[PDB]
Amino acid sequence: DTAEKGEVVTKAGIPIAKQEMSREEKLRRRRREKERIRKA
Amino acid sequence: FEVANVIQPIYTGGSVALENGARILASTLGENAILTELNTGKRLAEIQGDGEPISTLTITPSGSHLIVCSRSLTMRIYSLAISPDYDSVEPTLVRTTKPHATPVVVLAVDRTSTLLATGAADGAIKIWDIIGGYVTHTVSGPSVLVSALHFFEIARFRLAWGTQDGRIRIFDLYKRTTTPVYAHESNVQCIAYSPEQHALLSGSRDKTMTLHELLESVGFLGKWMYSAGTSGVLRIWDTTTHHEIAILSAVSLPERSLILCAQADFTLVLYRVPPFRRISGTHDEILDLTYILPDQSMMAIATNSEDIRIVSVKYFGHDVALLKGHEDIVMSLDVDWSGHWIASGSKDNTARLWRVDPANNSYTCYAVFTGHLESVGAVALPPPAFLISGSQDRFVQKRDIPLRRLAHDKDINALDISPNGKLFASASQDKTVKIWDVEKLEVQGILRGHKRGVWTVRFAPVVLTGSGDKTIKLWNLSDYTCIRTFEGHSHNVLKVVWLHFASAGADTLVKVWDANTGETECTLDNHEDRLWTLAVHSKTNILASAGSDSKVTFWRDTTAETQAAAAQAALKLVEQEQTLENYIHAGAYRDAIVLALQLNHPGRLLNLFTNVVTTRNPDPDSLTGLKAVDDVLAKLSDEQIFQLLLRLRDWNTNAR
Amino acid sequence: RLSKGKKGLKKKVQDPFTRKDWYNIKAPAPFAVRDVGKTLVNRTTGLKNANDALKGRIFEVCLADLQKDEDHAFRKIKLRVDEVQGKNCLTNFHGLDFTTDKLRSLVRKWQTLIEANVTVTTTDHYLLRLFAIAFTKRRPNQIKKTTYAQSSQIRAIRRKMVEIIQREAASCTLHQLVSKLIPEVIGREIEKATQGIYPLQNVHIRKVKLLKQPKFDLGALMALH
Amino acid sequence: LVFGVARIFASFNDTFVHVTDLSGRETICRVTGGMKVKADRDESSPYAAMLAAQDVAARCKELGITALHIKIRATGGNGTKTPGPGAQSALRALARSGMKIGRIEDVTPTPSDST
Amino acid sequence: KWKIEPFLPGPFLEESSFMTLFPKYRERYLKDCWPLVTKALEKHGIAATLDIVEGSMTVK
RNA sequence: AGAGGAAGUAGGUCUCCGUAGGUGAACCUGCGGAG
RNA sequence: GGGGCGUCAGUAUUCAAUUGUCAGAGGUGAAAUUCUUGGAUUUAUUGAAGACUAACAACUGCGAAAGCAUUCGCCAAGGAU
């Protein structure tokens, strides 16, 4: 809620941008968010 | 879409004032007060004022003060600061006082910059210092409405006032005694004085001046009297024998020898003393725009001023000419697609066809059409081929240049031709659109209906109907059904123009979109209250929007330019992202860190910083291990320092 | 803020107060003050000179500002104007009207009003109608609540009312008739002469209407002013 | 003090602030109630009457009469014989912005027998 | 748009006055309910008199 | 224009004085000066 | 303020005309239909038509009943004393 527009923040509290993030890490972050959504 | 440029009101209703520097000019629009240079025409400044309409303003011969008084009883003085460049000025307030119990209607400022006199509606008339708020002496008290004043000296100063009845009274400021002259029958409009001749001229509404048709402004130069009244003509008279040699106001510069005419068409005419240029004050309510020439340098606008004005688009404010053939109100307007023929429909029952001669000052109305008994509402054009005229009544007509029919029940609205001239459709208030054969008297069919009442049709070089509800439809020739329907407006639409589509509203917004998609592309929000008509540049995509408000806004397309900018931006982005990956792979941590701070994405910047603080072979004097990274951290800019700090708090959160 | 109109209806606005001039109004003879106001009329030229409109108009003005006495806050008079001078507007009597506030302020319950109308002609051949109203007097030292006159008594009162107003308005000219209308001599004499039939609380003349004036004579019309 | 006669037609649907000379013939300046309010619901409102009275008093003080005799009326034939809110609010705003008031009278058309 | 403000603060040249007439059975009740009426009309600034002899209420 | 197939991306106070006007002795406002 | 016939008025409404108009007016809880720069609604003055007789007007009057309220004239009739 207090991050920048282009960037995301991880669970570690570190800003990483969606542009510099690769395709494999994008897929893995989508899978982890979908795993949390399935848990809830 | 960006605003290419606007044309704006300069004058509406109130009093105009000229400084002895004939560059600057202060005029009124509504409640506001706007001052502009005359020669370059750009907007110097605009003071807002209070909510009530402004009554009277003046500027001193030295353009140092601007004194405004509204219809609410108030008076504000503004000091002005002019640079060597006359392009822009800043007005700042000095004094706000309430002069009398009634709002003042007349003001007069002396040739020197030290006294201004003001005259009210009850008759209480006073004199004030301009540099500081005084009443240096009150002169009459409230008797009858003061309609004129004049400051003069005899070669200490004296001031003359002319009342609402014919009473001219002169007093010395030092003697402080008023003496009338004989007194006069009706409303004296203005008083002027010649110091070369020791002579007072009084011009009045009973068509007389004392040492016609009407009188509004008289004055000297110079030995040549002048007069302006309801006749519309300025007349020049000799001083010594009475043989010679509407208008709301006229002032006398003559050291610069220009006389300004404030015509009650709300126009400003510059006359030379032995039509230099004219500037239209307000295009009051614009009924139709049509963008005319072969090269399209000169748009013809049409409004309530009982005539048409041709003003240039390629100084940008100068009107080339004025063309008057109609009698009542010019209502609609249409040009041939092959150049030189413009045609005008009117509240007068006559319609007409004018030539446009571009490389001359010649403009003629040489084709006229009697037609039917009601107002010719709209004109359409396929020497031109012929003319199709519509009507306030149901009588639609078609006539050739060197036939009638019944179409609808109510007043019809708009008319448009195809570029090949085989089809023709008409639109009206009884929710029908009618296409018919244009050569014979035959009918090709009928559009089924647009819910309330259809306002504008358009042909695609596919027919477009804009209606009285908040919808707009696209119909065909083949089935006579709507192909497309669109919503999204908040009032009437009143004009649909083809691109190279766009639609104005009556909800002051003009919006563009495309037909095969069918969803809204962009919306445009410049204007004041209303919007009426749209013209288009025929070569490129430039939209000219005008309405009941007097401003006309010119928009140009920028989509190709911003697409080229986004394309080259993505080119530069992929190039510098690859050189960042190259510097990371090569181990050039310095230029890698510079390029990462430029590319603003930090997940790689953190890895570069962990590497440079653990390089395993650090320089002993260096702060972060590398002298080059020390150099860039020393030579960082302010925005890069602040963005680095905004990343440093996020890296400082993590204990790793 | 947003307009509402149809296509091409707002004409260019012209100033209507260039063509207007003021004209002071003088009242006729029997009123106390003469300057009563000022009228904004159109500017004279060919094709309807403004003196025709000034001959046409009438004014309605109260009697308090005429007599300078606020006893007559009611009884609004009407002034025709038939003559014009230089910056001047000479007037004549046309009618005399109450205010409807006093017409409500006079009617009470349990008492009778008697109304009477006459069409009388003065010696200057002006026909005019006089409408008189007369409310019944509640006698002091009485106990009964209703002061009702009988119907035959009302008819006798109305007969004496029309006899008085005819006999005391047929003999004088219009200027003497207005000079008798101003301090209400007629209502006083009706009150004095009807009290042998049934006493009347207040007799007023509520309307005077001038129907026809067959003469335009500047001699008598200026002998007024 | 030049007395102009202000006809205030206060109905329930719209209020008419109208200013004439002493004759009744020559209209000086009128501002209706609905031309100052965007809503036909709130066309007859004290705010509408206040705006209309302020505009009328501003125009008549630009002309310099500064004194009015006020005649208030309503729909009186088969109507209500009572003025709406426009009368009270227009007279309040009219004398609150200058305008020494002279004589007030409520001249409603009262039928002797209508239907 | 509909709310009306109380008047915060000589607006009369001719001293206006109105009258109405009442009968006797109302004269009793008006005579012993009048001080409330003239109290509130004095708070509004208008003098209110009652006349039991003629039977007339006047405001001025 | 078409159902499918396969794929990718997501800043002048106070006081005084001289003025000019206001409703006048005084007093108020505005200005120009001195403490 | 019982009935018939005539007559006299009074406003108000509608319609029309003459001016001043100059943007809405009208309805509604909101709206809409409608009338609206050839000028609606409004302001003033006249003219015509049809209707009805405010306030007075009631723990009343008259008529057998329904009913009957502008003034004046005529015509018979009726009640009580």
Coordinates of C-alpha atoms in Angstrom, one line a residue, chain B residues 292 308 310 321-326 333 340-344 351-358 360-369 384 401:
Chain B
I292 CA -12.6 27.6 -46.3
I308 CA -20.2 36.7 -41.8
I310 CA -13.5 35.8 -42.5
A321 CA -12.6 40.8 -44.1
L322 CA -16.3 41.2 -43.3
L323 CA -19.1 40.1 -45.6
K324 CA -22.7 41.3 -45.3
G325 CA -25.5 40.3 -47.6
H326 CA -28.1 38.9 -45.2
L333 CA -23.0 27.8 -43.8
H340 CA -14.0 28.7 -53.8
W341 CA -17.8 28.7 -53.1
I342 CA -19.3 29.5 -49.7
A343 CA -23.0 29.6 -49.1
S344 CA -25.1 31.1 -46.3
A351 CA -30.1 32.2 -49.0
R352 CA -27.0 33.2 -50.9
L353 CA -23.8 32.0 -52.5
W354 CA -20.6 34.1 -52.1
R355 CA -17.2 33.8 -53.9
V356 CA -14.0 33.7 -52.0
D357 CA -11.3 35.6 -53.8
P358 CA -8.1 34.9 -51.8
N360 CA -7.7 40.2 -53.5
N361 CA -9.9 42.2 -51.1
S362 CA -12.9 41.5 -53.3
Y363 CA -15.8 39.5 -51.8
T364 CA -19.2 39.4 -53.6
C365 CA -22.6 37.8 -52.8
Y366 CA -23.4 37.5 -56.5
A367 CA -25.8 34.5 -56.2
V368 CA -29.1 34.9 -54.2
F369 CA -32.1 32.6 -53.7
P384 CA -20.6 24.9 -58.1
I401 CA -26.7 28.5 -60.0

